[PDB]
């Protein structure tokens, strides 16, 4: 366990930081020294934006991936015994190839958004260019890791659904229903992906 | 101490390789061994004593640290200012002997 | 005669040699390192007991002092 | 009481060995009326260097004092030895 | 026989334990002839001796 | 100041993709081989 | 927890398709009826080649006997265990070390004895249960010496552990062969059973419960077959794993009994064994104590495929085809010494 | 006016509701998914009753998609802070809360399939407790709703 | 003046080659003689 | 006359409130429902009673609804900060507590329903105890019900 | 001239006094009903005097409810940063101390009543050692009201 | 003159004193209750004595319960800071001496316990090694008592 | 004009691409090996075949050379931000989304060279999967391509 | 006008390459020495064939001593920041790359070595993949040098 | 015109440059050691043999002990940064490269004696690896020389 | 560092010796080298303390 150890020294000790910084800058009564808006505003929405298209294709791409060697370990297992399988539950991997698409529908969507600001001093200027590009930012994240997790569902149920099929021919096709409900999952982080950018300007 | 002990224990070798009438290990063995330990590390121990009866509280500031030009010796390095010299003439003495 | 061994068992003596003249000038330090840490458990063990033992006050100090000096020759030896 | 000879020889050597060193200790105390240093000097400390001389006296007798009693632990442990 | 004691002298130059340590020697000599023959089953007592 | 919005925007996007590093490195430190061979 | 399902089809998804796979293949209740409705040796052969089974017994000798069918069953599923523990990582490895370690604890005991009686280790070796394997040195050619196997096993031999409490040798020639594997046993299940507990997922919680029911299981065997022999209640306490549900307090009562009636009062307390106890008749022909056992150990390692995602399946495998090749070989003794009615004393494998 | 970056927590409240409620949702689905053909392979007549929990964790998904709706049509440039804080709030308690409640969702359906593959009269109890989840989950729905709206 | 500099380089610094020496002395802590050849027979 | 961001600590308390007590409800029920599950193979009988622990741990939900709700009610953009100070407080003395107090329901409902089935007279035993963790639920409602209203 | 801050570190006192407080007693009423579901199999007889460890528990978690109680009827605006100060230490140390008991009170009760199971001795040596971490609860209790009122 | 919060440390002090005192004594009080609780069933007779590791271990959380008094009423509003700070050490001195004694006397009191059930002579080396660790506690102490009037 | 640091994030991008794809099919490599070794010893006539998984491992690795050096043909000093920003989304982009396929790649070629040499009809099964994998890949280059020229 | 402190980025580059080199190098070197002594104890006459693992490993380690020398020979004082970004990634690029190629060298060298023993036939297929390891680090190369003179 | 602060980064390049070379020679040592041990008892006849390990990985310490030297003879107050952070980068250089030998070295020195005592004709490939983990350590050596003086 | 190369060589060196006495040589060897890393953590803190 000595990645795990060093995981969590460093999660008690981040966060230990933080507290004892947190309680000192109110105790001390600095001058709002800790200024969240500073932060939020100095950083470019270019970075908040870009970021946001990098992690709705990347991660939806790792949750279909996660998926895809969930249900390949186990559809070549059991096809050792049960050549049939591969007949039929291949469709665990279109799902999962599926699930990744979601992701890359919809950061090219995003991407298609990015513009320059021609801007400089942050006061009072762009600050719809701000609104956008936190929303660009959330949307890519939502879907992304809506994807994300989506794709380790569909992942696990399909490695189910290989297991059963193996065994009994007539299972796959009730099995099937709950990965749709797995695909679903999303889908609808596709939604709210495109409600949080459907009003955005940059530019 | 230990650098004229270990003198010593190299000296010792030439008798015993005299008594095996081993020419070579004394031609290409011990005199170039007691020369290389001799030039490097007895050197050394004269300097600490050169600077024990050189140098009085009169020459306190900038008196010369044995340790940093012991190292200096070995890299070739002769500052033109920083650090003054033991005696006259020692960057030459320095840069033979290594 | 094998001149690729002799080749190579001479030369690991060199490396040896240089290196150690190095390394052993420095081992010496040996004397030092300990000469330092003698003097220093001494002085400490002086220091915080023996001391203890005398006194401005006469009967406590010379009863005490034979007290407080046979745990100071206890610790001296030990 | 024989508690031991094994202990008893080594209260000989104890009470030798303090004896010996008390007794010199105490000397030198009253000699150098010094490198220890550590009399336990006033912090009203004034011009009398006299004062120096009568605080290393009454050191040099609590010395004596303990020899004293390693000489009566030597005497104790000499015969449980002796009777051991 | 002598660069050994004399380098570790030079570790433990200290004059009060060198009495100790002299006289500790003094004494398994002078009673050399009565703790060699004799039995000594603890090893560190003899391998001192 | 303590930070600067370059400092700062640095350590936002070293960290993510240090994630991303610790989170491959994981996996590949976490990879084994085998005991023995099957047979002849 | 989130433990499993995550990384645990990294290395071990082939292993769990492949071993599902082979249960697959175990007989069915059609597939054991088809069976006894043969009263001969061949064609029980014949049926067999139905299923994975067959095709195992060619260019054997032409009569077909009730030896050499069981130990060719034994070998089938020794190579398929082989197979799977060769092609497999230590997070899984180990786990199947254990199951190994029961077959090597039997045969060290046979190894003893053995020797304790001058027998020469190539002459015990082929009556070593497979998977005992001991394929290290000093174990072999310990020259008949006592101290010699004694010091290969403290020293190579994987077992080594366990023997901490059956030690100095003396051990061996003061104490009963018997008591003697029962207390290595008793270790190993200690070991084993914290083992799956460190594992703390669902390894844990779909094999713990096997070997808490074996471990009470034996508790109330040996209980009750301890009665007629002569040993020291004391010492057949030191033989009750504690790793199960009389731990708490149960085993001192059974380390008190003197009589059946006293260990089914002790099972009164758990509705689980009761009606194991109520449903053994043990009548002059009727099923028996054992029999529900069986029965029920196999409840158990079947429940065991319930979870997709742990190491307990590998458990149940080995022990369920196990009992297949006891079923097998049942029938096959059967039709041989022609007691028909007696054939439905197979223990269903589902 | 409305200051700028005011919009930041309201994105992230309506980002959090979705991902927390998928996260829920995915993992009661797995689980129930791999309890449903565990069960399968010893028998299939129960199958159609194992369904019901992968729809409560379905509904999970739609608790968070409700408030993320609600919230990102809400969203816009000039927001006044204060609307961004109740957005925020609303996302996370119907995510987190919904989260909650998949991993209840996704612990009893498994059990409960096994349960009731060994015994058929489990299926009324297995039912209740999943009730009791989709309660946890909508709670969420809830409060997080008297929020988006106040 | 300019101190974010300072900081941000000495911080991160001595925070990596911290970590490094603790996780190197964790993996030298722990390391493993084998437990055997003559382990079994000590123990 | 109020500062700004002054509705975020509030606003914290009302989604604090509903997530901890539904993650505490949630872990009391998944505990709950494996333990009824695997019991109820043996002992269908008692799967109208088993689910009691169940109930409890929704106690621990509502809770943590009604706090939520009344800090949401309570919430406005011109608060004092004093009053958001105290809505936070009340909000996680509930939600922690009743956190709390749904491990308890969890591992007691657990090892409860298994050791009825091997033991009836023990029912009544494991009501006195869950009785004391909804009373432990109770407590943080109390203290959150005085917060809110100072 | 009081600051703002001053009220959360206030209201965080009484928060923690409950919070940990009922954290501890909800861990020894999770382990002491462990143990006695588990004795219940052999020895029915004891359940009844076996939930002892159970209201010990539900005191330590009286002794936060009271500080908290305490402390958010002395919260009010104009606090002086110093009456906070004590307000978070009475919190924190009647809190954390019965958090503490809480412990002492759990594992002792889980293993004094599976002893008694065994050795009904052990029940008045189970009580006497429970007294002492309830001891050990009153002693965080006496702190926070020394504080509280400082 | 000195800076309003200045007395944030000395009550840290007061608190910590009373909780890691606490902490350590629940600690030797839960591992002494494990090892009483097997060893009565072996033998009744030492039951009653068995009792004295726990006793030593409320003296820990006592040792606590002065210091943080001390602390408590020589704390106020005009403090110096030179004082705070050595109430601040002061607490901690004794709080994580006393925490360190506590599980000196708890692993000795287990270890003892147990081997004294088979070996009755242990019993008065087991007081004795005791002993030594409740003078670890009073150390700290003694640390605590100068610093705090220092 | 250009907000300095422009480049570093730029650079950046180009390394990602890079670093993560070679790590990807490192892993995919390491564990396409480690199962044709182990195979390839029962039945060495598939060593050809089962050199696939390694070939598939190696492409992921050339789409990150592919955008390390688009990216590092494209660098700068009067670099925008705006610029910047976009190439390290994209080397983000194709370097993650390679790591995930190389390991998709890795642990499905283990199994297929395993489960190959057992049963052959497999292999064309084999091969489909893992093209999914490297289309994965593909796909995170074809976005990491799109985004550099936007 | 070059910012100041601007040469540390490239003096790391130089480092992390030569670094990281050296880990990825002595990973495979070690993974295969322990391959090499497992396998070559029964078929010594493979010794001499199965060093090649290790020399590969070798050759990562030059890859980073070339660019760390590169990067070393492109420092100077007024370096204008954007050159140090560049030469940092060029170091980082081929450091952490060619430590993903050494995981694959020694992976696949540990694997293969030992197979081959078992199946001389296995040789050249080893040899084969581990090219494809040293290719992953040269690609780590190409982007290194295309970087470090941009 | 010298920042300072400067000099720190330089001084801890000449304790790293040993520290970490340090820790890598005595893990070689350290690592070799227990496979000496092993090899001995089974045949002291290798006894002079299979110490080369130890000698390698001692000439590790010595790269480091090099440059630490030569940075610690460079450092002045009135240092220019620039040279302070090539000695850093210089220290980190040879300390974290000798650092990854050591490693190399200790890992295949046990395998290779250990193996050894089994095969003699193993001796002369053990050295060949050794030979590439020393090279492994110069490689550093070299870097660092070209920083610390450039 | 030192501390660590002494005390695990330490343990595998006297356990072996009491197995093979002849290991008593490799041991002192062994030892010696571990003490020689603490020797020049002691060099280079001498140079660089008195620079």
Known sequence: ?203 | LGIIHMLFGVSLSLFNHIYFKKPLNIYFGFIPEIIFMSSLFGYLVILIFYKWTAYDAHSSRNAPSLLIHFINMFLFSYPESGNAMLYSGQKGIQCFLI | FDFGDTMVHQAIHTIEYCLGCISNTASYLRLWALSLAHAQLSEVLWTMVIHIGLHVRSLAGGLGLFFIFAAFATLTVA | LCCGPKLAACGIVLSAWGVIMLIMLGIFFNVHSLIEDVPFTEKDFENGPQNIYNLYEQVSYNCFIAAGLYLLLGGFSFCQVRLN | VITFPFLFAVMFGDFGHGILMTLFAVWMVLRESRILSQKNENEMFSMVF | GFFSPGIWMGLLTTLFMLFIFTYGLHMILSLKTMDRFDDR | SFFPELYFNVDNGYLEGLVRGLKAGVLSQADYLNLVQCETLEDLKLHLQSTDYGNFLANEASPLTVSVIDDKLKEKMVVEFRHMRNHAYEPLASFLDFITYSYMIDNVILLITGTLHQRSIAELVPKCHPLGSFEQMEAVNIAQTPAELYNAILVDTPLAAFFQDCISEQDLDEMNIEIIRNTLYKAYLESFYKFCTLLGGTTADAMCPILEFEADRRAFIITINSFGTELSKEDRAKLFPHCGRLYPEGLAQLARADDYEQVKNVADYYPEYKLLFEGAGSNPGDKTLEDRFFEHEVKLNKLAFLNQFHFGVFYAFVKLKEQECRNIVWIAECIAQRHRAKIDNYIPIF | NNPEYSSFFGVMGASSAMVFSAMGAAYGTAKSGTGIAAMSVMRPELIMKSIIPVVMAGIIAIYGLVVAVLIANSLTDGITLYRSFLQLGAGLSVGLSGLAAGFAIGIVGDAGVRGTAQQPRLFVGMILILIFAEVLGLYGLIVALILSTK | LEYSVVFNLVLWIMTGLALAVIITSYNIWNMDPGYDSIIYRMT
């Open chain 1, 1 to 203: 366990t000595g990645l795990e150890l060093l995981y969590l020294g460093i999660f008690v000790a981040f966060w230990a930081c933080m507290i004892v910084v947190g309680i000192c800058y109110t105790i001390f009564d600095l001058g709002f020294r800790f200024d969240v808006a500073w932060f939020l505003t100095e950083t470019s929405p270019f970075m908040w934006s870009n970021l946001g298209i990098g992690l709705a294709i990347s991660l939806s791409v790792v949750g279909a991936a996660w998926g895809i060697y969930i249900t390949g370990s186990s559809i070549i297992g059991g096809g050792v015994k049960a050549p049939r399988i591969k007949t039929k539950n291949l469709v665990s991997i279109i799902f999962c190839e599926a699930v990744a698409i979601y992701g890359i529908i919809m950061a090219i969507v995003i991407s298609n958004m990015a513009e320059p600001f021609s801007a400089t001093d942050p006061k009072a200027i762009g600050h719809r260019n701000y609104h956008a590009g936190y929303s660009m930012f959330g949307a890519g994240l939502t879907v992304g890791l809506s994807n994300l997790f989506c794709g380790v569902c569909v992942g696990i149920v399909g490695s189910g659904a290989a297991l059963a099929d193996a065994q009994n021919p007539s299972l796959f096709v009730k099995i099937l229903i709950v990965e749709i409900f797995g695909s679903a999952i999303g889908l609808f982080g596709v939604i709210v992906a495109i409600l949080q950018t459907s009003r955005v300007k940059m530019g």
